[PDB]
Copies of this chain bind each other. A is one copy, B any other.
Amino acid sequence: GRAVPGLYHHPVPEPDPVRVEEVSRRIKRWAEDEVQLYPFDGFSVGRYMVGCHPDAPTVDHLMLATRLMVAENAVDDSPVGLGGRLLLAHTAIDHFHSTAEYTPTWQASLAADAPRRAYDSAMGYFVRAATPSQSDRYRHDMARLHLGYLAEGAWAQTGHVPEVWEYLAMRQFNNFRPCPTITDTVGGYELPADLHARPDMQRVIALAGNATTIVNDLYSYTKELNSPGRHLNLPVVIAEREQLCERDAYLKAVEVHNELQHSFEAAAADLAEACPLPPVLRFLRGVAAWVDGNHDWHRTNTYRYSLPDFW
């Protein structure tokens, strides 16, 4: 249950057990009764989402994020035909438009497997609740994610080890980013689209996702040593390119995380000063909350993750 030594992070309060438990039961019923996601603890994802969205006004708001997070996972369920699989699944998020003949056939494919059932349903709820701007913004962040996956899968098909910055670029896209960027939707307000689009806000979001995603590299490092092949993460890539020992490579990855997290904070503090509108200040706080909550989930989840003996 201990943090990575030297990892810069913020502790968080225990997540409201009443909420965790309610999310768990509703998420189990959705998975089983609505989308037949299998022929998985609700508790894991409930602690995750309650911890990451402390400002959600209701469990209904929390369930917007929870179903999308679970659907994200159903999709990870060779890489050779990945680009075709992911494109079709993307249509459950950004709909196909076609003729009266071909539309119904696409429509049937949305029931065809767990990942597409999961997405069609989870997105369905999101689109009813969110503004059209918040929906479009999510589709863009999902198109990023799928691109990230496809870079990673392309490298895996040849065992290619990218340069460190190249791995970092992939991991900018193959990245938690679609989760914190729905903080406004889940918080019951809107960050206006013209403000989301500012270059400074875009930089704040990218840094945040980049830091909180390297958190996962650091906590899941030991588990990934057993993944098929040579599964890439920042320590592994640093070690291989910068020809360092595993230990020093990992410690450097911790320092990289720290600089990304510190830069995220400085960038958010600056935007808060430059543009102190309420929906901006709340969004910035919710992104930091999602980030702190994501570190806490990784830290406490000793079922999935464990630490290397480098200290």
Contact = CB atoms under 8 A, between A and B. Distances in A.
Contacts of A206: 95, 97
A201 to B, nearest CB: 9
A143 interface: yes
B194 A132 contact: yes
A151 B135 CA distance: 23
A50 interface: no
B133 A96 contact: no
B165 A102 contact: yes
Interface string A158-177: 10101111101110110000
A173 B102 contact: no
A97, A173, A206 pick with most chain B CB within 10 angstroms: A97
A82 B147 CA distance: 11
A12 to B, nearest CB: 25
A147 B197 contact: no
Contacts of A160: 81, 84
Interface string A119-152: 0000000000001110110011001101110111
List the 6 closest pairs (A to B, CB-CB), nearest first. A83-B154, A83-B150, A87-B151, A193-B193, A143-B143, A132-B197
Interface of A: 80-88, 90-91, 94-103, 105-106, 109, 131-133, 135-136, 139-140, 143-144, 146-148, 150-155, 157-158, 160, 162-166, 168-170, 172-173, 193-194, 196-199, 202-203, 206-207, 210, 256, 259-260, 263
